[PDB]
């Protein structure tokens, strides 16, 4: 299902889905890889 690419938004993280960037909540996304603090991390929705 849809793959997200979130970073901290400067509880909620600023994501991208595949050229549009959508803002999400920490709880409804699920880490696919190790989360990185400064840069981006790839998540996937709790819906799948």
């Amino acid at each position: 299902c849809v793959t997200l690419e979130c970073r901290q938004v400067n509880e909620i993280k600023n994501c991208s889905f595949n050229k549009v960037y959508a803002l999400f909540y920490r709880l409804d996304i699920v880490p696919l890889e190790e989360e990185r603090k400064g840069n981006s991390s790839k998540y996937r929705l709790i819906n799948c």
Partner: antibody, heavy 121, light 108 residues
């Protein structure tokens, strides 16, 4: 039960390419981080790089200057490293290790025994 | 890069003494820190992985503390099996950087 084993020539002529492989048992390379770490004789630990299959991702320590390559072989469940244009600075004991993760957290929970690779003519 | 500095370089203590290894980062690393034990001739083995959380099978004598930049490994009752060099590692940001080691030996 989960164990790792580095294999490869312990001698590399300089300016040539080190090659090692880590055979993995009791776990599948498909689900965690698999990295290489080296340790020159009587000195500390340097992380080389990791590989990860859920997102098909490799990271490399910039200290290797793009001489390092990490290959995965899901077929035989072993992953390999190559290091090109080696110099004596690449003489070290090379560890493969499995890296677990949770949230922002990461660690090497099991290590191979390690193989020494002398770079010499 | 994040520089990682352990102190001291070396230490000797009596069996049953308490010993603490310090590891200091050059930035705050939000407890993304793991401690490893490397007995001579062996590969390192994991002790602690999220500043505080002790790995299963590791002895209750090993404890992990710290926040921000400053982090400690404390050996409650130094046993003779603890002869090793101990390594901290930060996973806050790649490239993940190891401490320079702290060698622990027994005063007997």
């Amino acid at each position: 039960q989960v164990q790792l084993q580095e294999s490869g020539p312990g001698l590399v002529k300089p300016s040539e390419t080190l090659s090692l492989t880590c055979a993995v048992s009791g776990a599948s390379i498909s689900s965690n981080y698999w990295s290489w770490i080296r340790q020159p004789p009587g000195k500390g630990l340097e992380w080389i790089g990791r590989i990860y299959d859920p997102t098909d991702s490799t990271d490399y320590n910039p200290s290797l200057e793009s001489r390092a390559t990490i290959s995965k072989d899901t077929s035989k469940n072993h992953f390999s490293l190559t290091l090109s244009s080696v110099t004596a600075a690449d003489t070290a004991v090379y560890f493969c290790a499995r890296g677990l993760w949770s949230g922002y957290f990461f660690w090497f929970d099991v290590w191979g025994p390690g193989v020494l690779v002398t770079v010499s003519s | 890069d994040i520089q990682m500095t352990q102190s001291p370089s070396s230490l000797s203590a009596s069996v049953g003494d308490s010993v603490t290894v310090t590891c200091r980062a050059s930035q705050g690393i939000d407890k993304e820190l793991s401690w490893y034990q490397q007995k001579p001739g062996k590969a390192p083995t994991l002790l602690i992985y999220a500043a505080s959380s002790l790995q299963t099978g590791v002895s209750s004598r090993f404890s992990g503390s710290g926040s921000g930049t400053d982090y400690t490994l404390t050996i409650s009752s130094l046993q003779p099996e603890d002869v090793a060099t101990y390594y901290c590692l930060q996973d806050y940001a790649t490239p993940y950087s190891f401490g320079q080691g702290t060698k622990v030996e027994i005063k007997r």
